[PDB]
Amino acid sequence: VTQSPTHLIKTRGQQATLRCSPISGHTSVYWYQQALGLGLQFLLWYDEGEERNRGNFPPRFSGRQFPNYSSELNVNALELEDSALYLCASSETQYFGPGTRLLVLEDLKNVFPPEVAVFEPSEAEISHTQKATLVCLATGFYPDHVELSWWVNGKEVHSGVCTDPQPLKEQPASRYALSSRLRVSATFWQNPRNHFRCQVQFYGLSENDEWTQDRAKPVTQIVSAEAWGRA
């Protein structure tokens, strides 16, 4: 089960297109809205090409299912309170896609990509514990729900990693910040061959969107930072 785009920023009054492709063979597609604080609300169901049901949603929430059972949802006259994770499921047992996160803003003026930095292990920690912790900081970004992952020697690692469950606000009265830690044995850090990267997938603007302002258009992009094993 597949959904595109991953993430989408729009503006009041615009139109949002959400795409979904079900598991091969499945003929039913279900759409759900997951809005922070309301849980999962049912939106639409399609079987064999047709609309079978609707949640409590006005006709500006529209869609369709294609002969191959793939489906799209079109949300018109977008409003701020349309911001949500939209989830697609197919076929008995329902299986979920990764969802399309929609953000609807008054304007694009506040979209900034992150700055990403990697902070190397304290020598004290290495002495005291035989272990080395790298810290990653992603700062100054908006909107949230970024994807931060660690990479060592070209491969994504999951062991020894911990990333904050939520971002914190930079002025709690607002752009965001995020941190993550990677711990390796001190021996691993002391190997000059070893290469560590903190990678942040930021979701921002696309071609579609209009940017005037002087700074770079804050496009959807990956911003990274790196560290080498001890020289």
Partner: peptide, 17 residues
């Protein structure tokens, strides 16, 4: 202080050890 940043605790698992 709004110009000092502190994250909540989180747990990492060094699986191999």
């Amino acid at each position: 202080d709004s110009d000092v940043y502190i994250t909540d605790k989180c747990v990492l698992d060094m699986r191999s050890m």
